[model samples]
Target: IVGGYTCGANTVPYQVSLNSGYHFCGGSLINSQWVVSAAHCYKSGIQVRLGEDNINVVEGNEQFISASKSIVHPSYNSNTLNNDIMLIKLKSAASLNSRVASISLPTSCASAGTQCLISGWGNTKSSGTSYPDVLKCLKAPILSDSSCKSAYPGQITSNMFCAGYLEGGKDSCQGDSGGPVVCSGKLQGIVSWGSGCAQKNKPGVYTKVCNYVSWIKQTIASN
Candidate 1:
């Protein structure tokens, strides 16, 4: 239920407070049991929720459940910002009708050049002001390994994907990380990282959801 995309640099999404009043990035429900989000969201606390923008429906009602162990990609390094993907196992499955859940993870990776969508409240320009309320969104096409590698050589692996405006009208930013990157009515990727705010030749990067199916399944099942 946290809100505000522009609180200055080092700003986080969803101002919801966790144990001891810590804050973190939060995402929408992808399923009854899973909510796709950023690996860094866990750094703030283990408890979280999804609700109306920046408003708590019930004080202390949406209790912090066991973030049933997190699964961050091994390739994700806080420094390098690579493979910035993870899954949150809610301690108890949530029940709701309004602002309800949705399916996630594609059965297979989409071919490059396939269209995709990006959503979040991030800076519009390089070092520009942040968004102020209202969940904003835009669309972009997925980039093939060839294009990604060509743009950022030796940076992207099978775990990474590139997408964005060809002329660069839209791109992901700070508060956008860990959000969904949907395409063709399917959840295909997670907002991971980018070189800058919509920089030319620097495509918006995401976690290749389909490519990590085995890893995600194994990690979730084992835990």
Candidate 2:
């Protein structure tokens, strides 16, 4: 059963429809001037949306901004998934509200065992088809660092996070990569990778939000 607000402050996965361009994973809005998402989602013809169900429904929303000029983490590691984060400077600051509002960043709250939420218009179910329209949502319990490391011994690192239910159900799939994994009214994690969509003992990996706070700030400092 999912637990939390029906919707997050700015909990949506913005995608860049830039073919061959970087496709950032997910993002959280820090302020009206800035909107955050995964570095991998940066692409040309980038399209930003703030909906859980329909990816194509943000064209008419006043609360949501359709700005571009995405800035990706300079040190982002594709091979190691290191520094895999980025932010888009909105053409204009977003006016805060329930539908197109911003969420606070955790100063020092979520722990290894923290419970989080992930929402997107990705695959409805692991190994299932990707939802073409409406958005999908799910709750994932954060996995310990050690457990995460062990589960993905080959690919795990200090810059990543592991979350999801491991009892053989519920997970983010290929299309969900770069989606938000929120908690405590803040963005805590982002859907990264897994052996399969929802494989047993294999939690959905993500880029830890806590680790890149400074980089994110510094990246946006100049721009």
- TM-score against native, each model: 0.77, 0.82
Question: What is candidate 1's lDDT per residue for 16-59, written digit by digit as tens?
Answer: 22222533354545556566666655563467554434322343
Tens-place lDDT digits, model 2, residues 1-223 = 1112234323343322211232223456677677666677666665454433344444444344455577777788777777677777776666555556566666764787777778654555555554434445677788888888888877887778788876657777766666677888777776666787777888788878887777767777878
**Least well predicted 10-residue stretch by lDDT in candidate 2:** 15-24
* Model 2 local distance difference test score: 0.63
Sequence-dependent TM-score of model 2: 0.82
lDDT of 1 at 173: 76
Candidate 1: worst-modelled 10 consecutive residues by lDDT: 1-10
Q: Residue 158's C-alpha lDDT in candidate 2?
A: 78
Which structure among the candidates has the greatest lDDT? 2
* Model 1 bad stretches (over 4 Å): 1-28, 54-68, 96-98
